[PDB]
Every structure is written in structure tokens, then in C-alpha cells.
Amino acid sequence: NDPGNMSFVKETVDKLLKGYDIRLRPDFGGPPVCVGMNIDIASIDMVSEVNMDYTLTMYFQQYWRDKRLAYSGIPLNLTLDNRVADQLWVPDTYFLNDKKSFVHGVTVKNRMIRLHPDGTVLYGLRITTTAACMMDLRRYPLDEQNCTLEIESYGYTTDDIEFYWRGGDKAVTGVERIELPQFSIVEHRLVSRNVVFATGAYPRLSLSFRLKRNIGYFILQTYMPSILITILSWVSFWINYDASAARVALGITTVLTMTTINTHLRETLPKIPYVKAIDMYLMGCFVFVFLALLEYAFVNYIFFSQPARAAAIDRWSRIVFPFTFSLFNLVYWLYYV
Amino acid sequence: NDPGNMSFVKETVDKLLKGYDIRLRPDFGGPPVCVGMNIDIASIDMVSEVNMDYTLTMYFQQYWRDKRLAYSGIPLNLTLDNRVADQLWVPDTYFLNDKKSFVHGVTVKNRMIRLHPDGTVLYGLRITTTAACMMDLRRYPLDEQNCTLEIESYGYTTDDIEFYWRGGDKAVTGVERIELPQFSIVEHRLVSRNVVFATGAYPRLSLSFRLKRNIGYFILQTYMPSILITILSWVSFWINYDASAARVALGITTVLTMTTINTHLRETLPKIPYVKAIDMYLMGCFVFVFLALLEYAFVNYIFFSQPARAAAIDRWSRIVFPFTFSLFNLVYWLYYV
Amino acid sequence: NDPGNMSFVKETVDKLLKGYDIRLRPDFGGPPVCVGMNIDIASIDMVSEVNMDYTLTMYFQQYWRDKRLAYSGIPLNLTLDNRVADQLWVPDTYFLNDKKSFVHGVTVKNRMIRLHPDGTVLYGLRITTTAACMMDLRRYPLDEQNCTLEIESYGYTTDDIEFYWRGGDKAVTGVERIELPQFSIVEHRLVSRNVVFATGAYPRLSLSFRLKRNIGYFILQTYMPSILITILSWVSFWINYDASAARVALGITTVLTMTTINTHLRETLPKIPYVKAIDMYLMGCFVFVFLALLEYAFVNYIFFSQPARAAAIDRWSRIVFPFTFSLFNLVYWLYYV
Amino acid sequence: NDPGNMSFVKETVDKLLKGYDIRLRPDFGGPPVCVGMNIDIASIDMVSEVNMDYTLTMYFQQYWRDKRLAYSGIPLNLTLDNRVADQLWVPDTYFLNDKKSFVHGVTVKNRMIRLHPDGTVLYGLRITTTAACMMDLRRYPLDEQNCTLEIESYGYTTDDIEFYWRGGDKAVTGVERIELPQFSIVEHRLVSRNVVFATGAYPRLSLSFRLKRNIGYFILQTYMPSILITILSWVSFWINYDASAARVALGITTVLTMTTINTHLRETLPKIPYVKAIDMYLMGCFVFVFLALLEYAFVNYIFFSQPARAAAIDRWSRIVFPFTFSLFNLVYWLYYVN
Amino acid sequence: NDPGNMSFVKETVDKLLKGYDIRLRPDFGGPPVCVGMNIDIASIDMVSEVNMDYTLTMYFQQYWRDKRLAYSGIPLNLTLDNRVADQLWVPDTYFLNDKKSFVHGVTVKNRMIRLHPDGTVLYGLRITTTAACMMDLRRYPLDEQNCTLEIESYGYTTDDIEFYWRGGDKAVTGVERIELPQFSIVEHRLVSRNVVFATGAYPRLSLSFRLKRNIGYFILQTYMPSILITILSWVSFWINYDASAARVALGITTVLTMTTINTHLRETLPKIPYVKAIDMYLMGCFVFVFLALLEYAFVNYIFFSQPARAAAIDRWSRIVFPFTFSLFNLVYWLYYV
Ligand SMILES: *[C@@H]1O[C@H](CO)[C@@H](O[C@@H]2O[C@H](CO)[C@@H](O[C@@H]3O[C@H](CO[C@H]4O[C@H](CO)[C@@H](O)[C@H](O)[C@@H]4O)[C@@H](O)[C@H](O[C@H]4O[C@H](CO)[C@@H](O)[C@H](O)[C@@H]4O)[C@@H]3O)[C@H](O)[C@H]2NC(C)=O)[C@H](O)[C@H]1NC(C)=O
Ligand SMILES: *[C@@H]1O[C@H](CO)[C@@H](O[C@@H]2O[C@H](CO)[C@@H](O[C@@H]3O[C@H](CO[C@H]4O[C@H](CO)[C@@H](O)[C@H](O)[C@@H]4O)[C@@H](O)[C@H](O[C@H]4O[C@H](CO)[C@@H](O)[C@H](O)[C@@H]4O)[C@@H]3O)[C@H](O)[C@H]2NC(C)=O)[C@H](O)[C@H]1NC(C)=O
Ligand SMILES: *[C@@H]1O[C@H](CO)[C@@H](O[C@@H]2O[C@H](CO)[C@@H](O[C@@H]3O[C@H](CO[C@H]4O[C@H](CO)[C@@H](O)[C@H](O)[C@@H]4O)[C@@H](O)[C@H](O[C@H]4O[C@H](CO)[C@@H](O)[C@H](O)[C@@H]4O)[C@@H]3O)[C@H](O)[C@H]2NC(C)=O)[C@H](O)[C@H]1NC(C)=O
Ligand SMILES: *[C@@H]1O[C@H](CO)[C@@H](O[C@@H]2O[C@H](CO)[C@@H](O[C@@H]3O[C@H](CO[C@H]4O[C@H](CO)[C@@H](O)[C@H](O)[C@@H]4O)[C@@H](O)[C@H](O[C@H]4O[C@H](CO)[C@@H](O)[C@H](O)[C@@H]4O)[C@@H]3O)[C@H](O)[C@H]2NC(C)=O)[C@H](O)[C@H]1NC(C)=O
Ligand SMILES: *[C@@H]1O[C@H](CO)[C@@H](O[C@@H]2O[C@H](CO)[C@@H](O[C@@H]3O[C@H](CO[C@H]4O[C@H](CO)[C@@H](O)[C@H](O)[C@@H]4O)[C@@H](O)[C@H](O[C@H]4O[C@H](CO)[C@@H](O)[C@H](O)[C@@H]4O)[C@@H]3O)[C@H](O)[C@H]2NC(C)=O)[C@H](O)[C@H]1NC(C)=O
Ligand SMILES: *[C@@H]1O[C@H](CO)[C@@H](O)[C@H](O)[C@H]1NC(C)=O
Ligand SMILES: *[C@@H]1O[C@H](CO)[C@@H](O)[C@H](O)[C@H]1NC(C)=O
Ligand SMILES: *[C@@H]1O[C@H](CO)[C@@H](O)[C@H](O)[C@H]1NC(C)=O
């Protein structure tokens, strides 16, 4: 009668667990059990471009109804100890694209079981998962990624279980509080659907983030040095061929600086082995400075033979190099932006 | 009845544990159980800006009152084996902002259970937690950080549990004994409050450390070599332009060495979106040495056509550049201090 | 009586598990039990030549028949909770060449047990296995690797268990969706056989992939700088010996640059006991630039004595060096392709 | 009565464990139980100054007495399976300053339980632990570190348990067999004491090692190249100002080599706020070579008008610079070595 | 009562485990129980000089006799489930020199229990271990290490347990199939003896391998570039002395390149007190490329005094330096053989 009688509550719980078979899902052999899901994103730790995965920490909550656990005489929600979850049936929900996930267990396992008078069960966990995400890095470092978290029942088909987001589009909270330095979250989407494998149908939930990479750091750290080196190489064009030490020194310095910058950036860039926009841009700048040095060498060679042709070639190079470089850069930016 | 009669003590313990339902909190269905907490910090192992987290080892102790475990006739504090914690109810206290924490287990699980005659239980653990601490590296390496550890009940709301520091501001000890190689703990604070989530009000305790970095390592590591390289670049001014090869070689060598040093230091430093103060200083030094190189090239360009103007430019620069660098350093050390 | 009667299903399951011995294989002492295996490869996480291993995430399903588990009266397939797998006999199937393999356990253990009216048992796991694939890196980065996953029975010989691929060549799915940055899957094969060891004959199932390495990344990042530096070294032949000092620098620069590139590529692959194709190409480029510098030094040695021979040597080199390098590139790209 | 009656031995053991309570220490409520501890060190895997900790593998053995486990009629010592250790009370011994530790469990858990007729229990555990050792590197690489392993009971106070080294100073063996490539173990000390916390008094056993670093590697790695380069830098003084190219080359090469040595030193190093001995030495060498180059530049600036001034400066420097550098080296070695 | 009757075999197995005490070794209080051992080495994953340890995967089989498990009427070798190993007595065999080892547990724990009519028990495991191996790196990389694996009884003395190699020198197989990229296994040895500790005599088995390293990788990696840089230093001798800029640039570049190579090589191995062969050779190469610069400076010092003597000593240097360097290489490669 009185809710304060802990012996009465113990009797009720023992009656609920009396003859309770954890091997059988609720409504076994009947209608599928509907499971609602909530995700409270604590934070996103890292977004690894090298491994193409991201670490996500979240409060994952599942909401279902098992009439076997329905009780009476206690007008309260029984917030039981987490250990009782080992004595109850819980959905075999897993993440399709995770690689290494775990449940935090300090001080105790971060697990919560709440029972309601109508038999409703709420089961909460705190989970850190490293979810894989295939990244299209052709547009790097101006790409926009779409990283997904897929949630699926491992063993129960759609005839036995039906996932759905609990709360419409509000099923996932805390996205706006995510503090990602390198990336910025633009839009998150919730999808509920079914899939069909050789063993039958399966429910599926999907949480998708669209990450827009910040561009200021890359512009201020990778493109401007190469542009400055190209302009410095062009500086040697406007020095007379009477003395060769100045122009040779300028060309050598430009080549060495460009090579060292390329190597240094490659040592602080993702090691994914395929072509990127930044690599093409740097290689184009390298080709431009190499062509400038070639033209200076040819002019120096022919100066002792044909001064008039040397002057004409120098003037035409002064005409061609800047406009050609600007055309190349503008078409590159239009192609990528 | 005597303590020497270990059979009597065993019978008392067995009677305490008989009919003890671990799935219900003390005073279940009634007022919340007040839980006091003590933290005895052993050491802060590391504070990493790459992962933006700090590793902390501590003794975490929880004091609470459980009338079910009250015993009479034995006026002694019963220090039981840690395994008895598997037969007792314990709070589901967890850390809000950790990433990978564990309880040490050599030679046994570092766990302590102490019962008291009035029915009060003390439960102690030794926990090494890697708590995530978002850092504002804007003023690096002259930054001041504030790293917090949050303690919260996972399942039970404020109606079922309440937290408080046991000892006021003296609850957390061992802070002054912490030996951080690269930081100094200016202050620590203790906060007790209640937060609100969709499932209700939850108790919350906060332990905050304000850290200040030590500048000596970076002063003797990055700043002084850069200043020395800048002075070496200046040295070329005091060489006559008749032997231009020596000055050109010195300028090229200084530029290449400064670039290599800056690239290596950048490789050592982590990756953040904005620009660190150390990066700004290195950029300024490289700008100064590059401008010195370009100024010498400009002078040597018209060295013979207008020798008087070249000599005047060199004599002006020999005073202008040190004054400009001193002004830049004054602005730098005034803005960040 | 009713198919949806949970009590009836519980009684049937209890009778199935009552008197069931988990220490004895089905039809113990009789004909061997046949196990049919399906593999659904979700993704290949990474392939590493440093450790010579590949990470594989898959759904591994085993099919067998245990007449002790046959039940009647329920015309449905029982999808039991994964925790029932501990109460049944499961094959001792392991992977012969795995290093660190584990079964995912979030939120629950990624395990599925399905019983059928005729005693048929389907047992599915989600396994992330780091399989050791010995690699031949002689042709690297133009290599074509053959990586296999071996499946064997540990304790039971061919007299107690037999393996076959359920579904023939369609047993292993998901290969078409595998996305590898550095590799492209060419073909996958399934092999079933028996292997003889000192303890008897054991079943063996081999799943082999042939992987082909993409070459665009290495062409853009490694070969192009080498070719450009070699051409820059050639440039010196078009400069008269009157700038003998400056020419030195140019030649020096190339070698210096080459050395830097070599360092950039030094920490890329482990210590193979032979010569990789990329290392051979870099050695060839270094030899070419070194020989160009030696030729210039020889020219400078006799420049004062026999200038006509010096000019003749320069003219000969202008044709020999590009021709020899083109011949070397032709033979290299014919040998490795 | 027959020892070979394995059924009789099983019955005796079951009777010993019948009604046995693992939640109560031996002689609960009476005198504190005395635990004698032995340690057999197998190897110190590594000592890292980056994390300031050392990895240690040992054979931590404990010795106590529990009259509840006293058996009669069998004049033998019962070496039981390790699993029976889960059925007996064991001290809550832990290491005060360990970060990661574990008990090896291949092929079985490396755990040993031996029972004696009087009720005495011997409990062996093969343990690998990474113990944190705070290091003062202000004298690196001449430093002599002191790394301690602490052992303490967790829950029981001194009123419930007491710790003592079994065998006196010979409790810990195998220290001489440790061969650290970098350090050398000068001495090991054993301390038994009691500490006080807000929860009462606790026993404490300290095993301390004094590690003396070997300077042989560093001298032939860092000090010698810097000394050689600084001595080489004096050659620029002997060569007259007329051959300016060679002097410029010597100055540039000395500066570049010193800078590269400094960068390599900073490559293999942890982060500390103070100044280490080798760091100060490299800073001094760099200052000396930089001053030599600056002096040469000044001479080249003024030699165009006063060749006698340049000659006098060179002659004075050829004595001042070596004398100053030797004085700096001598004072450095006096300040650090002794 | 045929062997195919699973009920009879279950009864026999239950009878064997009826009253079996896992806390007592076979023949307790009597003669020691012999335990033969077999090792089937699958692979040696790595041999790292950084940590002075090597990884090893092997099938470890222990073969002994337990008369309490003797059964009759079933003329078959009972291959039981792996979990039955938790209900038997197994030796406490451990590895003396291992650092961290484990038994693979996918899909089940790799563990085989086989019983024979005469009570003989065969117990097999698949173990991956990290065995410590102190390496004498004085002659790196021309060294020849001897790495051992020690097998011992943790608790039982020679009075209770006597180890031996089952099958003599054939007790270890799979040695000839070991694939080490950097090492070649010259020989392996098996030793059986007894070792006296404070608690008495313990049986001991030793499995030793002698590994010889391969030199081609280091010949192509470091020695060849060092020799090339030494010849590059030699280049400056075959040049007219008046070309100060060329020789200065050559000397500076050679010194910088040699120092860069040495620095990029120093990080391979930890701070071993002794000096490796590589270190001695690199120091010698640096000495030669430094004496080249010193000789050039010495010539430039007496350039004004006796230019004829300058040319003569330049020719003598041309004669000497290659000969002295050849002598150095000859003695170096003769000592390390
Ligand atoms: C990152 O990339 C993933 C794909 O890899 C994107 O995921 C897709 O998201 C879109 C929505 O943005 C999904 O489209 C929607 O799918 C719903 C489910 O479809 C299933 O169920 C229906 C029946 O209910 C079947 O007919 C169908 O075949 C599927 O089995 C639909 O209900 C939605 O319909 C809505 O739009 C259509 C028009 O497109 C209207 O006609 C409808 O009336 C309705 O308004 C819709 O089609 C898509 O399914 C997702 N695919 C996958 C594989 O997940 C992420 O969106 C992307 N990230 C971001 C931020 O966009
Ligand atoms: C690192 O950064 C964190 C924040 O990110 C700082 O933490 C904050 O610390 C301050 C105190 O320094 C906290 O402010 C205090 O909050 C208490 C709790 O407030 C709740 O409860 C009260 C009722 O008890 C409600 O009224 C209130 O709405 C909340 O629900 C207050 O009790 C404290 O009151 C004190 O100040 C007020 C005036 O402001 C006085 O009137 C009071 O008498 C009393 O003195 C106080 O307001 C703050 O909540 C913390 N924030 C977080 C997020 O934890 C760390 O301090 C910082 N590190 C360092 C070293 O400073
Ligand atoms: C990577 O490299 C591995 C080797 O290291 C390759 O694996 C081998 O692949 C070949 C096929 O290319 C396999 O050869 C096949 O073996 C089958 C099994 O033979 C066993 O059983 C039969 C009885 O059934 C015995 O007689 C025999 O001795 C063996 O004990 C055969 O059935 C195959 O023959 C079939 O096809 C041929 C035509 O190709 C027909 O003529 C036959 O009638 C029959 O239908 C065949 O001989 C070999 O066993 C594999 N070895 C291992 C260790 O796996 C991988 O293929 C390679 N990777 C890739 C992608 O190719
Ligand atoms: C690394 O650094 C640590 C310290 O940080 C060193 O450890 C110290 O070692 C010394 C011994 O070399 C210890 O000194 C001895 O302590 C004993 C225990 O003290 C307790 O008991 C006494 C009463 O007996 C109490 O008064 C005290 O408060 C403690 O409760 C003492 O019994 C010893 O006494 C001896 O010396 C005194 C004079 O000092 C004589 O009067 C006595 O008769 C007797 O001869 C002694 O004092 C010291 O306690 C240790 N400190 C710590 C913190 O453990 C390591 O030795 C060092 N590493 C190396 C390799 O040296
Ligand atoms: C890597 O390095 C290890 C050592 O660290 C080498 O291992 C040694 O191997 C040799 C054999 O090659 C071992 O020598 C043998 O020791 C056995 C055990 O000796 C104990 O028992 C005997 C009595 O039986 C006592 O007298 C002795 O004191 C020990 O208590 C002996 O039984 C062997 O005797 C055999 O050879 C002798 C001749 O040498 C004959 O007279 C005998 O009849 C018999 O045939 C033998 O002496 C040595 O013990 C091993 N070392 C250790 C520490 O145990 C590895 O060999 C090496 N790797 C390689 C590839 O060589
Ligand atoms: C509380 O429950 C106990 C056990 O069922 C019962 O004996 C007792 O009477 C109950 N209290 C009241 C007030 O009924
Ligand atoms: C062993 O002890 C049991 C129990 O006392 C007894 O029944 C049996 O006869 C004894 N056997 C021998 C051989 O001593
Ligand atoms: C098989 O074993 C059962 C159980 O012991 C027994 O009843 C039956 O008779 C046996 N079968 C035969 C053919 O003996």
C-alpha cells in the first residue's frame, strides 16, 4: 500500500522478475515491439581525416514497453539500479559503421533503468564510439563532408522490432553545443527506414551531420606562401641579364623554398594517398617557378648570341607569365569553388 | 558477542546482508539520500593540448547513510573486504566530461567499504580519469586555462539523491602537492548546483583548476634562437657590397635556416584553427629576415648606378631595422602581458 | 498451444535446454557435423605495410544442425537473445592468421542465435579482425598483393566437423562495396579444403582478395619532383663555364634538393631486405644528378687548358643526359609494367 | 591419515573452507594481522623521462597467518591452484604511485597460494607496474635520480594490518641482475613506516633505487661535437682578413652546425621550465661561435681603414677566446660534476 | 552401449567430473606429474630493438596424465568443449621473460581439451606473447642476436611437476616457415633443466633462436648516400683554387647534408650507452667531409704566400683522400665480419 515500504517494493520487483524469461522479446510471436530512441550528444572528440572516422560521445536512450514488467499499487516510476539491466531483456541495438565503441564504467557502468506503471521501460547508456566516415578529399581543403551514424537491430527483423526517433526531429539534442575547431556543423538529419539482407528485413535509424571545413587557416598557411614564392620568382624577370648572380640566386632560393614548403606541408597534412586540390595547386606553382627558371636560363644562353631575340623573349615572358598564372588560378578556383 | 568471537561478527554481517535488495536506494520512496564526497588528488599525470585533455589520479570517497546496514552491539567501524561492494547498493556517480577512466586493480580492486554503527557507509575508490578540457590556445604559450571535473548522478534525480562536498572548501586535498612540469595551479574551486535535463533535475559538483603555463622553456626554445637568427641576418649590413657573394650567401643561409627552424617548430606545435602568438612572432621574425634579404638585393640591384643612394640606404637601414624590431617586440610583449 | 503464448515458448525452450550437454558436439561419436559459413564484409578499415596486416570488419555466420535442439509445435523460427549462446554448443572456429580480433559489444554483444524447427542453428557474430597479410614490396608502389583470411576448426578434426561455403561462390558478399583509398579490389576467391597436422586433418576455408595499388598519388607526389629536379640539373649544361661558381650552386641545389626529397621518403615503409621500385628510381635520379655534377667538375678541370674540348663535352652532354634518362625511364616503366 | 588419500585431502580442504568468510580479516577485532612482504625483481623494462616513470616486473609475495585455514594430520605444505585464491581473504595491498599495472594471466593467472599446517598463507603474484618517478632534470644528463616504489594497504588501518619486510634488508632480491642500458643502480633502500590520513594510520613499505645515469653516450654524442666546432671557430682568427672567403665559410659552417646540434638536442627531450646542464652548455657554445662571427664581421667592417687595428684584434682574440671558453668549461664542470 | 550413444558418453563425462577437485594436482602427495610440451610457431610478428622485445604467436600444447579422468568402454579420444577446461586441473605453466601475452578468443577462446582412455590429457592454446630480448647492438646492423623464450612452473616445484620436451628436438615445429623481413633464423635450440629459487627447484624449458640481420636495406639506405656525399666533398679538390665561391659552397653543402643525414639517422634506436657501427661509420664520413673543408681553408690561408705549394698540396690531397677513405672502408668492413 504505502510506497515507502521498501519490503513492499522488493516484493513487487520479485513478482515482476518471477518467471521472467530474458530470452524472449516482449509480445513474442505477436506484434513487433516499437522502440523509440534518443541521443544526447555530449561532444565530438575528433574527426580523423587520416583514418576516416570520428569519435562521438552520447547519452543513448531506448524506450519500449514490456507488459511483463508492468506493476500496480506503486504510483511512482521505479528508477532501479543499473545492475538490474542484466536481468531484463534489452534490444540488441548496435551501430552499423562503428569501429571501437565502449560503455563508460566509472565509477559504475553508466547505465540507467527506469520502469513505469504501464510496463514502459527506459534504458539509458553513455557510449563513446569511433564511427567510420568515408571522406571525399578531392576538394580538400575546401570540402564538405557528410558523416553518418547508423543504428540497427542485429538479430531481430522488422517483424519483431520497429525503431523510430522519439520526439520527431528533437530526438537528437546537443548538436548546436558541439565545439569542433576545424569543422563547423551545418545541418543534422534524422532518417528512419528499413533495409533488406539475405536474412530478411531490418529497421534502420540514421543521424547525419554535414561538416563544412574552415578555410581561413589553410588560406593563411598553405596558399599564400606559394603565391608569394611565385611572385618572388617573377621578380627575377624584371632584372637585366647583364648580371647573372642575382637571378640565379633568386631562382635557387625560390626552388628550395617551394620544395621545403611542399615537404613541410606534406608532413602536416592527412596522408591519404590520392590527389587533392591543394596538391594540384602547389604542383602548379612549382611548375610555374620551374618554367620561369627555364626561361631565364634560355635567355641567358642566347644573350651572348642574339641579344634582340633575348630581349623579345624576355618581353613576351613578362607578358605571358602573370596573365597565364592568373588564368590558371582563376579557372582552378572556379572549378573547385 | 565479543569482537574476538568472529562467528558473532559473521552472523551479524550475514543478517545485515539477508533480505537486502541491492536494486533499491536507501530510504527508497522517501526523501533523497544525501551523499557527501571527498577527493584526495594524487597526481595530474599530463595535460595535452593535442587531445585537449588532462589525466588525473585521485581517491574518490562517498559518504552516505543506509539504515538497512545499521548494526548494534558492535561499537567498532567495520572495515569490510572490497568484494562486499558487489552485495551492496552504491551511488551511480559518474564523471560528466571524461573520456577513458578506470579503477586500479592491483593487487586487488582499489576499493574500500567501511560500515559504521549508526548505519553510515563510506565507499572509496582510486580512479585515474582522462578528463577532456577544451583549451583557449589563443595566447599560447602565455595562456591561462581553466580545466574542470564534473561529478553527477547518472540515473537518480535530485528527488532520489543529493550531492555536497564533505568538508566545505577543504573537501578536495592534495592540490598543493601536485607537480605539473609545465603548469602552475593558481587556484582551485568547488561548486555545487543542480542542472536540468529532459528527465528532471540532477545534482552536480564541479572541481575547477586554473592553470598558468611556464614560459622559460619556450623562451629558451623558440624566441631566443629566432632573435639570434634575426641578428645574424642583420649582420650582413656591416659588410661592403663589393664582395657581394659573401652577403648573398649569408642572406640565403639565414633565410633557409630560419625557414627550417620555423617548419620544425610548426611540426612540433599542434594544429588549431586560429593563429598562436608564437606563430605570429615567428612570422614576424621571418618577415624581418626576408625583408632584409630583399633590401640587400634591392641595394645590389643599383649598387653601381647610384652608389651614394645605396650607401645612404644601407646606413639608414642599419639603424631603422633594429629600432623597428625593438618596437615590434615591445608591442608583442605589451599586448600579451 | 497458441503460437504467441510466451509461456508455451518458454516451456519448449526450457525442455530443449534441459538435459542438453554443452560439452558434446551434435551427433557425438557419429558422423561429423557440417558447418556452412557466410561472410558479409562490411568494410576494410586499413591496410598497413609497416605491420603487413589488414583490418577487416565482417558479419560471420555459421549454419549447422543439432538434433538435440529440434522442437515441435511451434511453426516459427526462434530468434533468441544472444545470451543464450553461452548455453549451446558452438563451433570452435578461429582465424588462422589473425592478430587482434574481437567481437563488438555495444550496446550488447554483436551476436545472434536463431533456432529452426528441424534443429537448424544459425549463429552470427560481428568480428573486427586484424589479419596478418605477408606482402611482397619488391614492385612497390606498383605492387599487386594477395591477402587471405583463413578459417579453421581448433579442436575438432575432420572426424568431428566439416566446413563448406554456404551458397557456393556467393557465400561472401559486400566485396563490391569495399572502399580502399590506396587499393582497388581485383578479384576474390573462396577455397575449401583439408589440412594435415600432427593431430589429424582439419577443415580449412580460405577467402582471398587480390589488391592492386593506385599509382596516381605516387606519380604526382614522388616521381614528378624527381623528374623536375633532374631536368633542373640538366639546365646547367646550357650555362657557360664563365659562371662556374653559380653553376656549382645550381648543381649543388639539385643534389641537395634530391637529398631532402629522399629524407621526406625515408620514413614511409619498413626495412625490407631488398630494393623497392620507388627507391630504385630515386637512386637513379640521384645518380644522374651526381654524374651531371661530376661532368661539370671535369669540364671545369680542363676548361683553361682545352676550351674547345670543354665546349664539345658540354654539347655532347646536352644530348647524352636527356637521352640516357629517357632510356632509363623507358626500361624502368617497361620492367615494372 | 594417509597423505595420498586425495579424497581425504579434499575433505580437509572443504572443511577448512566450510563457513569461511572472505569479508573478515584474520583475527577480526583482535590484534592487527602482520603481513611480511618479499619482492623478487625480474627486470626494469624501461625508465622514461618523457613521462617520468619506470616499468617494473616483480614477484610480489605476501606472508600472513589465518588460524581458520589451519589443518592437522597432513605434515605437508599444500600448494593449491591459483583459483582457490578467490576463496580466501587477501590483503588489499596496492602500490601508491602506479599508473598502469596488471597481473600476467598466461597461460593461467600468475598467482600462487601455499598453505601451511599452522594456518600460514603464502601468496605470490607476478606483477608488472608502471610507477611514476618524478625526476629533477636540472642536472641532466649528470643527474642522479631517486625512484621509489610505494606499497600500502587501502582500506585496513594500522589497527587492522601491519606491514614489514620479510628477511630484513634481503627482502628484495635480483636488484643486481637489473641491467638498464642508460642508468646504473647505485643503491636500493627499504623503508617501513606508518603514514597518517584523515581516515587514520596506514602501513607503508618503500623500495627506493638511486639511478646514476651513464654520461658515456652523451659525451660522444653532444658535448664532443660542440667542443670540436667551437675550437674550429677559432681558426677564423688565425687566417688574415685578406682571405675573407674562408673566414666567412668557417663562420657560417660553425653557426649552422651549432644550430643543427641544438635542434637535434631539442628533438630528443621532454619539456621543462628550467634550464638543463646540456642546454646551458649548448647555449654557451652557440654564444661563443656567434660572438666570434660578429667580431669577424666588425673587423671586416673596420679593416678597410686600420689594418693594424685588425691585426691587433685578431692577436688579442686568439688568446681571449680560447681562454674564455676554457674558463667557461672549467666553471661549468665545477658547478655540475662536483 | 555403443560410442554413438550421446547419453552414455554424457554419463561417463559426468562420472569423470563427479568429485573431481581442481585444487589438487594429479598424484597429489606422490610422484610428480610429467608434462610434455609442444610448440607450433605460427609466426614472429616483429623484432623491435626500440623496446628490446619480439612478438611471437604459437600453438602451445601441454600433454600429461590425470588418472582421475580414466574411463573405459568408450574407445574414442574425447575432444571436449573448450569451456570444460575451466572444470579440470591444468598446469600453471607461464613464460618467464614475457612482457604482455594473451590467448586469442575469437570466435571462441582458442583452447583444445582432448581426453584419452588412460587418463591422458592434451591441452592446447593459441598464445600471442611479447617476449623481452636484450640485444647487443654494438655491431648494428651487422649483429647476430640470440632471443630466448623461457617456460616455467609458477607455483609447483620439481617435487610436484617435471617438464620435458615431448618428441625431443621435434617438439618445436614451424621454425623453417618463419618470415622475418629484417632477420634470418640461423638456428634454434631446446633446453630442459631445473633452476633453484628461494622456494626450491623448478622445472625450466628454454627455446632459443639465433637471428642474423640483413644488410641490404642499410647499404642502400644510409651508407650509399654517405659515400656519395664524401665523393661530393672530394669534388672540390679537382677545381682551380681561385674559384673561392664554388669550393666554399661545396664545403658548406657537404657539411650541411652530412649533418642532416646524421640527425635523421640518430632517431632510429634508443640511448644505448655504447657506440654502434653505423655511428662510427657516420662519424668517420663526417670527419672526412670536415677535413676536406679544413684543407680548403688551409690552402686559402697560404694561397697568397706560395700558390705553387697550394697547388701541390691540392694534388696531394687528391691523391690522399680517396686512398685514406678506401682504407677506412676496408678496415671497417673487415672488422665487422
Ligand atoms: C548524408 O548521406 C546520406 C546518404 O548516404 C543521406 O541520407 C539520406 O537522407 C535523405 C533525406 O535527406 C533520405 O531521403 C528520405 O528517405 C525517407 C525514407 O525512405 C525510405 O522509406 C520510404 C517509405 O517510407 C521508401 O519509399 C524509400 O524507398 C526508403 O526505403 C523518405 O521517407 C523521404 O521521403 C521524403 O522525400 C521524398 C522526396 O525525396 C518525398 O517524395 C516524400 O514524400 C518525403 O517528403 C526521403 O526520400 C534518404 O533515404 C537517406 N539515404 C540514406 C542511405 O540514408 C543524408 O541525408 C546525408 N546527410 C545530409 C545532412 O543530408
Ligand atoms: C572555470 O569555469 C567554470 C565555468 O565554466 C567556473 O565555474 C563557475 O563557478 C562559479 C563560482 O565561482 C559558479 O557560480 C556559483 O553558482 C552557485 C550555484 O548556483 C546554482 O544554485 C543557486 C542556488 O544555490 C541558484 O541561485 C543558481 O541559479 C544556480 O542554480 C551559486 O550558489 C554561487 O553563488 C555565489 O555567488 C553569488 C553571486 O554571483 C552570491 O550571491 C552567492 O551568495 C554565492 O557567493 C555562484 O553563483 C558557476 O555556477 C560555475 N559554473 C559552472 C558551469 O560550473 C569555474 O569557477 C572556473 N574556474 C575557476 C578556477 O574559476
Ligand atoms: C593467393 O595465394 C593463395 C596461395 O598462397 C591462393 O590460394 C590457392 O588457390 C588455388 C586456386 O587458384 C587453390 O587450388 C584449388 O584447390 C582446390 C582444393 O584442392 C584441395 O582439395 C582437393 C579435393 O577436393 C584435393 O585434390 C587437393 O589436393 C586439395 O587438397 C581445388 O578444388 C581447385 O581445383 C578446382 O578448380 C580447378 C580449376 O581451377 C579444377 O580443374 C578442379 O577440378 C577443381 O574444380 C584448385 O586446385 C589452392 O588450394 C589455394 N591454396 C590456399 C592455401 O588457399 C589464392 O587463390 C591467391 N589469391 C587469389 C585472389 O588468387
Ligand atoms: C629517495 O628519497 C626517499 C625520501 O623521499 C628516501 O627514503 C628515506 O629513507 C630514509 C633512510 O635512508 C628514511 O629514514 C629512516 O626512516 C625510518 C622510519 O621512520 C619512521 O619511524 C620512525 C621511528 O622509528 C619515526 O620517527 C618516523 O617518523 C617514521 O614513522 C627511521 O626508523 C630511520 O631512523 C634511523 O635514522 C635516525 C636518524 O635519522 C636514527 O635516529 C635511527 O636510530 C635510525 O638509525 C630513518 O629515519 C626516510 O624515512 C625515508 N623517507 C621516506 C619519505 O620514505 C630514499 O632512501 C631515497 N632513495 C635512496 C636510494 O636513498
Ligand atoms: C642463447 O643463449 C642461451 C643461454 O642464455 C643458450 O642456452 C644454452 O644452451 C646450452 C646448450 O646449447 C645449455 O647447455 C646445456 O645445459 C643443460 C642443463 O644443465 C643443467 O643440468 C646439468 C645436468 O644435466 C648440470 O650439470 C648443469 O649445471 C645445469 O644445472 C645440460 O644438461 C646440457 O648438457 C649437454 O651437453 C653437455 C656438453 O655441453 C654434455 O656433457 C651433456 O651430456 C649433455 O649432452 C648442456 O650443458 C645451456 O644450459 C643453455 N643456457 C642456459 C642459461 O640454460 C642458447 O643455446 C643460445 N642460443 C643458441 C642458438 O645457441
Ligand atoms: C511492509 O511490508 C512488510 C513485508 O511485506 C509487512 O510485513 C509490513 O506489514 C508492511 N507494512 C505495513 C505498514 O503494512
Ligand atoms: C580416504 O578418506 C575417506 C574419508 O575419510 C575414507 O572413506 C577412505 O576409506 C580413505 N581411503 C584411504 C585409502 O585412506
Ligand atoms: C543409450 O543410453 C541410454 C541412457 O543411458 C540407455 O537408456 C540406452 O539403453 C542406451 N542405448 C543402448 C543401445 O544401449
Ligand SMILES: NCCc1c[nH]cn1
Ligand atoms: N546526466 C543525467 C542523464 C541525462 C542527461 N541528459 C539526458 N539524460
